[PDB]
Amino acid sequence: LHYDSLSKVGIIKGLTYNYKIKGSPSTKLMVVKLIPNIDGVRNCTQKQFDEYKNLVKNVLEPVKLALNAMLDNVANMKNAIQNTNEAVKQLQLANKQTLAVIDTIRGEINNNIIPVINQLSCDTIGLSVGIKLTQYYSEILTAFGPALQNPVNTRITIQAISSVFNRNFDELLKIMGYTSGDLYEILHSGLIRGNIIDVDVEAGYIALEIEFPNLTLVPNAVVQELMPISYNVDGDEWVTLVPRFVLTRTTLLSNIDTSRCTVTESSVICDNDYALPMSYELIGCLQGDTSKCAREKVVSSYVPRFALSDGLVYANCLNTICRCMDTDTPISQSTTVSLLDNKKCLVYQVGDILISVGSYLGEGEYSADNVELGPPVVIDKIDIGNQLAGINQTLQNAEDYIEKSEEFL
Amino acid sequence: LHYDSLSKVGIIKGLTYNYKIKGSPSTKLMVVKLIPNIDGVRNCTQKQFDEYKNLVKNVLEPVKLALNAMLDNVANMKNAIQNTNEAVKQLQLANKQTLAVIDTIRGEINNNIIPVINQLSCDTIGLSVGIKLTQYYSEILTAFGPALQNPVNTRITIQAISSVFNRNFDELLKIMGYTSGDLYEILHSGLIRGNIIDVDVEAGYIALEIEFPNLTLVPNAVVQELMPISYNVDGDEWVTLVPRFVLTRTTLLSNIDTSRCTVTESSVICDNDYALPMSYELIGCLQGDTSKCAREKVVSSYVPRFALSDGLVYANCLNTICRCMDTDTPISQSTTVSLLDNKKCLVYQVGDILISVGSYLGEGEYSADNVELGPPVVIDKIDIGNQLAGINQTLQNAEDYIEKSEEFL
Amino acid sequence: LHYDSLSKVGIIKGLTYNYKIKGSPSTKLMVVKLIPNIDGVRNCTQKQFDEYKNLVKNVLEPVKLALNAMLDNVANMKNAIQNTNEAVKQLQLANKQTLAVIDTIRGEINNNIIPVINQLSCDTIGLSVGIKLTQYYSEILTAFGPALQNPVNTRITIQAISSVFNRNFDELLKIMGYTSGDLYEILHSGLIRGNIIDVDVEAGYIALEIEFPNLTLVPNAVVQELMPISYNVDGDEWVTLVPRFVLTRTTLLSNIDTSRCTVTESSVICDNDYALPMSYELIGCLQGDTSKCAREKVVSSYVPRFALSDGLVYANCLNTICRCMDTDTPISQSTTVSLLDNKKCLVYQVGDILISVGSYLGEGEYSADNVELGPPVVIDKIDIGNQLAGINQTLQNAEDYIEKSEEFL
Ligand SMILES: *[C@@H]1O[C@H](CO)[C@@H](O)[C@H](O)[C@H]1NC(C)=O
Ligand SMILES: *[C@@H]1O[C@H](CO)[C@@H](O)[C@H](O)[C@H]1NC(C)=O
Ligand SMILES: *[C@@H]1O[C@H](CO)[C@@H](O)[C@H](O)[C@H]1NC(C)=O
Ligand SMILES: *[C@@H]1O[C@H](CO)[C@@H](O)[C@H](O)[C@H]1NC(C)=O
Ligand SMILES: *[C@@H]1O[C@H](CO)[C@@H](O)[C@H](O)[C@H]1NC(C)=O
Ligand SMILES: *[C@@H]1O[C@H](CO)[C@@H](O)[C@H](O)[C@H]1NC(C)=O
C-alpha cells in the first residue's frame, strides 16, 4: 500500500492485525467432585456433613433436570463421761453427713458437668468440618462456577485450565501448539468453552467437557484497516471509496468481509477463509495510481471529518473549524489530514463533535477493616491447699492429745 | 423521511436509535486484598487462618502462572475409757480419709475438667474467625469474581465500580461526563472492562486495572431502521429495495453499515465513524419522489410478508391470508400494511408462520425455609446448702455435750 | 441446489441450519430473599446474624445506588480424761474446717466453671447459625449471582429457571411452546435475560425480572452455507462468486445477509426477517445452468484453496501441492475438490498453511484430599467410691467401740 500518496487522497492508515483460521477443537474431560470423603469419627461430623450435602443437591438438581429435558441434543465421773461419749457420737454422725455432701458434688459433676463438656467437644469438631466444607465449595465455585450456572457453552475459567493441565502452563502451550501470543488472544476473546455432558446428584459428581481450539496461522497475511475521511478539492469536499478491510500478503491483495469474524487486539480470527479476489481497477488505488477510486462528491450527506486509532485523533481542519478546549485556541492546518496530539489538551472539538482523550486516574484499594481480637476466658486453677494443711495441723493436735491421755491412764 | 408515502411503497418505519462514538478509555487501578490482618490473640486463630490462606493460594496460583506464561503480552472405768479413746482415733482417721476424697475431686477438676474447658474456649474463637474469613472471601467473590476467574477482558461488576468511586455514583457521572442515559447503555452492553496486570500470592494481592470508556455524542444524529415487506401491484407482488439502516441528521442523509457496531436499546455505539455518502437517485425514495427505488418483481423467492417492532405486528393481509388464533376469525384488509393489535389475541397467523405475542406471567419467590431454634443446654447451679446447715447443727450439739461434760467433771 | 454440478464449478456445500424469528418475550418476576427468618432463641444467634446481615448490605448497597442513579431509565482419771475431751474438740474443729474446703469447691464450680460452660454452649449455637447462613448465601450466589453482580442484561442461570417454574422443566417447555431443540438453542446462545427493577437493602430483597423469548419457526426454511474455493481452468485458476448464505424453502430461493443474526449449531435466529429476493441470472448457478456465476480470473490476489466443515478438510490438491505430516507423503488428486480424511494423520499441509485436526485427550479429575479426623477429647467419669466405702468401714468401727464402752460403763 502506497500510503505516501493514499493519505493525500483522503484515506488514513488504521489498525493493523494478523490473520488466523479457527480450525477444529480438541477435547478433554474432567470429573469434578463436589463432596469430599471424610473418614474417622462419624458421629461428630454427620450433622454438618448432611447440611453440606443438601447444599450440593440444591445446586445440581436443576442441572440434572435440564440435561434430561434436553437429552435428545445434550463416782459422777461415769455421768461426766456419759456426756463425753455422746459428743463423740455426734462427730461420728457429722463425718457421715459430710460424706453425703461430697457425694452430692460427685453426682453433680459426673452427671451434669462432664456429659455436657463431652457432648459440646464433639459438636466443636462438627463445626470445624462445616467450615472446611463451605470453603471447599467456594473454591469450586470460582473454577467450575460458570459450568454449574449454565450447562451449555460456558466460558471456562483459568483455574479450570490449570486443573486440566496439572498446574503446568508450559504443557498447555506445547501440547496445543500455541505461542504466548495465541494464548493471550484465546483467553481475551473467550475461545475456550465447555459443556456439562452428565451429572450424578447423590455423589455430587459432574462430567465437564472442555474444548480447546486449534488455531492455525496464515503466513505473511496481514489484515489492514483503512479509514476514509472527507477532503477539500478546489473549494468543495469529496470522499474516496474503498473496502474498509483489505488483506495484504506479499505482493497480493484481496478483500475480507469481516462481519462474521472474531477480532482481538492483534489478530482477526475467522472460520474457514473469507478472502475474496480484488479487481484491477481498485488495486491501482492502493498500488499508486491514486486515480479513479470512485471519489464521490458530497452534497446532502453527513460525512466524517475525523478518524481515531490507537488513542490518536486525525482530522480535517482545513475545510472546517477545529479547536482545543481549555486552552481556548483553534488549530490551523497548512496535506489534507492533520494530526492532533494528546499532550496539549484532553478534549478537542472538530466541527460540532467533542472528542474526549482518555486519562489516568489515581489508585484505590479494597480491603476489610483490621480487627483486633481479645483472649479467651480462662478458668483459674483451684487454689485450696493451705486450708488442707491446717486440717492436717488440727488433726495431729487431736492425735497428740489422745496419745497424751493414754500415757496418763 | 416522507413516511406518509413510503408506507404505501412498502417500507415500514422500524426502531429509532441515536448515534455515539466509542472514543478512547480512561484507566483506574485498584489493589484488592484477599487476606485481612487480624491482630491480638494469635494461638486461637492460627489454625483457621492457615486454612483460609490455603484457600487463597489455590485461587491465585493459576492466575500467577497464566500471567507469567503470557508475560510478553500481559476401777474398770479405765477399761471403759480405753474403748472411748479407740473410738476417737477412728474418727481422727475418718477425717483424714475424707480429705483424701476431697483431694481426689480437686485433682480431677483441676487436671481433667478445667484444661479442657480452657482449650475448648480458645477453639471457639478460632471457629468464629474461620466463619468471618469465609464470609469476607464471599463478598470479594461477588465483586471481583469475574477478574479472578479469567485474567483478561472481564466484565466488571457494579460492586467493583462502587469501590472505585468510593460509594458515590454522582462522582462517576460527572468525572466521566456521563448522563443517566449513558450509564445505562454502558452497563447494558458491558462496555466497562478490566484486566489483571499482576498478582502476589503470599500476600493475597491482585492488581486489577479497570477501563472506563469515554463515549462521545454526535449532535442531532439519528439512526433509523427501515423494514421492507412485499406489496400488491395490480395482481402480483413486488419488493422495494433500500439500505436497512439510514442516518438522518437534519436535512442530510447517509448510509451506515452497522455490522461492526454495538447496538443498545436506544443507541448505536460505533468505533470511529461509519457514515458514508448517499447517491441522489436513492435519496428521492425517502424525500418524496417515491419512484425508482429498484422495486423488484418477485417470482421464485421467499419474501417477508410481515415485520415486527416494539411488540407490534405489521403485515400484508391483502395479498395473502392472515388470521387470529383462539377467536377463529380472519383479519381483512381494505393501504398495503395492516397493523394487528395485541389486545384481540396473543397468537396470529400470517400465511404459514405463527407469530406469538408475549404476555405477563404471575409472580414467584425464592427463600429458605424458616427454622426455629431451641435454647442451649443450661447447667443448674449447685444445690447443696441445707445439708451443710445440718452438719453445723450436728456439730454444735457435739460442742454442747463436750462443754456439758467439762462442767460435771 | 444442484450440488452434483456446483461442486465441479468450485463451490463446496457447507453447514446446514434452520430458520427462526426471535419474536417478542414473555415476562415473569421473582422476589429473591437474601436474609432468612430465624425464630426461637435470639441471644445465641444475634452476634452471627448481625455479621451476616452486614454481608448482605455490602452486596446490595451498590445495586440500590446504581438503580437510583439510573432511575430515569431503570483420781488422775479426771486429768487423763481432760486430755480426752481436748482431743474431741480438735476433731470437732477439723470437721468444721473440712466443710470450709468443701464450700470452696462449691464456690469455684458454681461461679467459675458452670457460668463458662453455659455461656460457651450458647456461643456454639451461634456458630452453627453463622455456618448455615453462609451456606445459604452461597446457594443464592450460584443462582442469582449474575443478577447481583450487574443490574442490567444478565444471563440467567439454570437454577434461576428451575426456581421460576417450580422444579418442573416439563412446564417450561409447554408453557413457552418450546421443543427440546428450542430449549437447547436458547440456553446455548444465552437468549434468556434478566434485569433488577428494584431492591430493598434492609430486608435483603431484590426484585428480579426474567424475560423468556418466544421464538417462532418458519416452516420448511433452510439456511444453507456455500464455501467457494479456487479451481483450475486450462492451466490457470478462477473463483466462482455467490452469496455465502442462501435461503432455500421449497422451490424458492432468496438471499440472507446474516450479519446481525444469532447463529447456533443448528439454527439461525434473526429478528424480524432478513430474506431478500434473488435475481434470475444467479438462480441458474444453483438450479443447474452452471454458467455465468461471475467467475473471476485471479491474478494478483490471495485466494483460498481449502474449506472446513464439521471437522473435514476439503482442498484443491490439483493446482497446488498438499501433503500429510508425520507420514511424510503427498496427496494426489485425479473433480476439483479432494476430501482429506482424518484417519490418516492429524496435521495436513495445503500450500503454506498447516491445518490441525483436533483429537481426544485423556481424562482428569478435580477433588479435595480425603482427610481422616480423630475423636473428641473425652473426660472420664469420676472414679471415687472405694475410698468412700473405706470411710464408712472406719466410721462403724468408731461406732462399734463407742457402743462397746457404754456396755462396760
Ligand atoms: C457413634 O455412635 C455409635 C452408635 O450408633 C456408637 O456405637 C459409636 O461408638 C459412636 N462413636 C463415637 C466416636 O462416638
Ligand atoms: C493433708 O493430709 C492429706 C491426707 O489425705 C494429704 O493428702 C495432703 O497432701 C496433706 N496436705 C498437707 C499440706 O500436708
Ligand atoms: C501463645 O503461645 C506462646 C508459645 O509459643 C505463649 O508464649 C503465649 O503466651 C501464648 N498466648 C496465648 C494467648 O495463649
Ligand atoms: C456451716 O459452717 C461453715 C463453716 O466452714 C460455713 O462456711 C457455712 O456457711 C455454714 N452454713 C450454715 C448454713 O450455717
Ligand atoms: C435473652 O436476653 C433477655 C435480656 O435482654 C432475657 O430476658 C432473656 O431471658 C434471654 N433469653 C435467653 C434464652 O437467654
Ligand atoms: C458410705 O456412706 C454414705 C453416707 O452418706 C453413702 O451415701 C455411701 O453410698 C456409702 N458408700 C458405701 C460404699 O457404702
Residue numbers in the entry:
A (entry chain C), B (entry chain B), C (entry chain A): 23 to 96, 140 to 399, 402 to 476
Give the article text:
Langya virus (LayV) was recently found in shrews and isolated from febrile patients in China, representing the first human-infecting HNV from shrew origin. HNV infections are facilitated by the attachment glycoprotein (G) and the fusion glycoprotein (F). Upon G-mediated receptor engagement, F is triggered and promotes membrane fusion and viral entry. LayV F and G are closely related to MojV F and G but distantly related to their NiV and HeV counterparts.
Using EM imaging of negatively stained samples, we observed that LayV F formed well-folded compact homotrimers, typical of the prefusion state, but that the protein spontaneously refolded to the postfusion state. As a result, we collected two cryoEM datasets 4 mo apart and determined structures of prefusion F and postfusion F at 2.5 Å and 3.9 Å resolution, respectively. Postfusion LayV F forms a ~150 Å-high and ~70 Å-wide conical trimer with a prominent triple helical bundle assembled from the central helices and HR1, surrounded by three antiparallel HR2 helices yielding a 6-helix bundle at one end of the trimer. The opposite end of the molecule forms a triangular base. HR1 and HR2 motifs of each F protomer interact exclusively with the other two protomers forming an intertwined network. Glycans at positions N65 and N459 are resolved at the periphery of the elongated trimer. In contrast to prefusion F, the fusion peptide and transmembrane regions would be located at the same end of the structure to promote membrane fusion. Postfusion LayV F shares its overall topology with other paramyxovirus postfusion F trimers as well as with postfusion coronavirus S trimers, highlighting the evolutionary relationships of these fusion machineries. Although F refolding affects a large fraction of the trimer, the N-terminus, the β-rich domains comprising residues 281 to 420, and the upstream helix remain mostly unchanged, besides modification of their relative orientations. This conformational transition leads to a greater than twofold enhancement of the surface area buried at the interface between each pair of protomers within the prefusion F state (~2,180 Å2) and the postfusion F state (~5,220 Å2), underscoring the irreversible nature of these structural rearrangements.
